[PDB]
């Protein structure tokens, strides 16, 4: 594959470098169209910039917390973090979000990796070997209310049991209801004057609940859970303007008020180098 | 039992590894694909589309005006604009090219820089765009700029001039992050003759500048960008 | 002697001519088409009114002044009250369509100004309030009037900063979307053919706007000495390959 | 060799190797030849 | 020893994984299979069998009466019954269809809704069943209902009318759990003419309604149901 | 008008059954031609035979 | 490849792919044709 062909002097009626950008087209002008060039080869395929590679690596998409402690007298297990849940979404942590939002529609399979790390902030005689249970609770499935509900039986919901300090790994097929996931959605759930706007109404993927299976020890253990997402078998459509301003909320395109200029201001002239 | 020996790295989680893993939803049948126009396969595809350069940084805040390059009537020899060619910073940092380029550590290839005249039809002008390859300073006058790669643009019927910034380098790749040894040079524009306005016409005409990559382009070593961040996890 | 500048577009009983065009853009190089069996899900036989809805409808003209920020229309919203097309929109549960957008604006060889005409698929607007505030139905359904980017914020409405495309992205990068410029010195019209773009075969035409059309002044308007400091901008849109499905009662929408 | 029954569990797809920028760079109705006047 | 590298996920117990495992009872010979009628291979097989809908929720407790849809003599234009089409809730929640549907997250396809008349043979009536696809409200009068998918049912020799609720949607799948964007619409019934009873006959006649799936039907993403629970493990 | 002037007009034909249009929007809903004034000085709009009965009275 | 001697230790069977609802939907003695009067 040639990068540049050999091209010499020129004196024509054919002017490749004069165009009309109001047509909306970006004419494929090459260096050999405006200067004398020599032959060079690409020695390059562009593998690393393939959308499969671009979205094909794990990125942290959520961090949450649960803890192992005596549940005696706790009236709201959920609030006490005896167990916690995550309303599944990929737009909470901004790094992966900006990448995905480089496109309008996106379709792919997902590979999840869940890392659980223990912590004992105050006096403990040892570190306990806790087992985490991550259960997927799809829309319509009964949500856990107590860390040891009948819901954790998980007869139909899928769930993994892994050691804290260890990692959990599994993949999920493309689960969108449509032919592709929407990164943006200029619409509502119905024609209502007050209903929510944006993908907020589209990305209703249920949530996944986490808990520590072990009963409590004398001391209290804080387990932090990090979920990583890697896309595979990727397809992307309709490229768009990259995000410029900071995000403020999951799902909305909203940006903060009194935000700072994102375009750098010259320390001098428009003639400055 | 097949005898085995586990190697260093066992149990590690390399975010970049590409392995198989059990499916949590066995026998699930995903929704059929339907045709959707505008499919993108490679980022190198979209960086070939040019976007506007906010060449006129000069303002106190982001404005439509930062994209307008002012041109002044009856000025001779003078400089219209200038900029270094660190495509991963400066004026280029917010463009589609600069934005995508920042997702990678290395870049190589030729850049496509365009200028579209928006002054009245009955006006005229001849400008000169110049690319100064690394090794010397940004040109300080037309004569100096003219000694390097350049294009004398005659404004007319065809509104846009496309000047290529041919890959001129010793090392075959440069860092997207501004690095001296890896500098790309300078870009400048000057009045070849001058801008002439017709009768009953007054003020300023502007130039719109565009940037895009040639099929020449190469990008490698994916990395996180400095164009996005957060202090706390976002919530619904 | 055929030129990129002279064109005629005939849809139904409506025809458009322009002697100062700059070619025409066909979004993602795809011409609109009807929904093929292989992609269909909804089992209802669809209705194709053809020429009674696939024709040019001209919106109310806007006035471009030295201070205009830009305008934003949404489809199919902008045509929600246009003849038979509009009626079908509310009488059916689902619908799908493509369009030919034709923006007009003439001046003289003494004027100067440059409008960016772009089509943005799934243009999800942002709330000027930031945080997690939503944008109420009415504010993204301005209809034929469209949204004026120089108008003041209003409770429940979207942010209208031209610089940030009403969505947190920079104006200069709007060019990644199918667009065209109306550079008075070259142009006087912009034409964009839009094929149906969505992640579903067919969809509700009232609760979802597939794309929004934006006409944004980049190089400000400039008129010759002592001339009227304004120019009109006219938007004409024609639906094409329009299909309606699931006919019934007729929606009653917010406001 | 694939160890699992479902397609979703296989590893990455491998380079699309299609690459056609024209649907974004030249989405014009009338073909424009490099060198020929853009507006004839 | 074969060199190996253990990957993330090692040691995990995914309740959904499908692997081989050693048998705790080697050489055990299970009992021979004998023919047993009524074998079921797929749940999609049984949801095609219709069951009675407790359309008449109105009672203070579960009763045979919740399955009886009352019909009143000499009423014109009037509405007989109505219901939204969230098959995973409301009247449908306890039916075989609703019950099975709740073991999955997504559904798609056409529904088969039937009405069997039980009034005296010498009585007569003409009713109209209507399906209002999403986007508009539940019809408030016959005229409004009649504008959408419907069937004018003439009561007679053939006791049952089968009205299909054809899959009418943009997105190809809906959530079994009531979700607005994913709503299926409304179902209603009205008097086309009116119920006429013969001499010496008095009171109320009832309609029995049934629900089942068409071979159209699709169900996916298995999950636990909200139709069963316990506070403590059961004992013998 | 002078060569250096410009304009875009719209000619419309309203077939029988409704009144003469009272504004552009109303006229635009029927048979019409958007005329761009320029190099070619004349626009030719056809009034296609739109009728039920196959002949009309000149009177 | 199966690593164990007993059948019970192998993984899941894979879709029956039979599917005949009629033994539940149409368990009638005299065949009833769709469209023909149910009770003749
Ligand atoms: C955009 C976009 C795309 C997606 C896909 C979300 C996938 O949702 C899941 C997740 C996150 C986990 C599981 C899952 N299956 O088993 C487990 C367990 F191990 F966590 F229990 N988790 C299943 C689905 C459908 O979400 N937002």
Summary of the model, kept short:
Chain F: It is found in: Virion; Host cytoplasm. Chain A has a single domain (1-273), classed as Sandwich (Jelly Rolls).
Topology diagram in text:
The structure is cut from a larger assembly and holds one copy of chain A (273 residues), three copies of chain B, one copy of chain C (255 residues) and two copies of chain D (40 residues).
Chain A: E1 2-4, E2 18-19, E3 40-41, H1 51-54, E4 59-68, H2 77-80, E5 83-87, H3 94-100, E6 103-119, E7 131-137, E8 159-163, E9 167-172, E10 181-182, E11 207-212, E12 221-239
Chain C: E1 7-11, E2 14-18, E3 25-26, E4 57-58, E5 62-65, E6 71-75, H1 83-91, E7 92-104, E8 112-121, E9 147-148, E10 179-183, E11 189-194, E12 211-222, E13 230-247
Parallel strand pairs in C: 3-11
Antiparallel strand pairs in C: 1-2, 4-13, 5-13, 6-9, 6-12, 7-11, 7-13, 8-10, 8-12
Chain D: H1 22-25
The complex binds the ligand Cc1cc(CCCOc2c(C)cc(-c3noc(C(F)(F)F)n3)cc2C)on1.
Subcellular location (chains B, E): Virion; Host cytoplasm
Function (chains B, E): Forms an icosahedral capsid of pseudo T=3 symmetry with capsid proteins VP2 and VP3. The capsid is 300 Angstroms in diameter, composed of 60 copies of each capsid protein and enclosing the viral positive strand RNA genome.
Protein name (chains B, E): Capsid protein VP3
Oligomerization category of the chains in this entry: part of a larger assembly
**Which kinds of small molecule does this entry bind, naming each only once?**
ligand W11
| Count of folded domains of chain A | 1
**Strand percentage of chain B:** 25-35%
CATH architecture of chain A: Sandwich
Sheet bearing the most strands of chain A, described?
5 strands, antiparallel
- Rounded to an integer in angstroms, the radius of gyration calculated over CA atoms of chain B is 24 Å
Task: Tell the overall outline of chain A.
Answer: elongated
Helix content class of chain B: under 10%
Biggest chain-to-chain interface with counts: A-B, 100 and 99 residues
Percent helix range of chain A: under 10%
Helix count from the secondary structure assignment of chain B? 3
CATH C-level class of chain A is: Mainly Beta
Count of alpha and pi helical runs of chain A:
3
Categorize the overall geometry of chain B: elongated
**What is the radius of gyration of chain A?**
26 Å
**What is the H-and-E element order of chain B?**
EEHEEEHEEEHEEEEEE
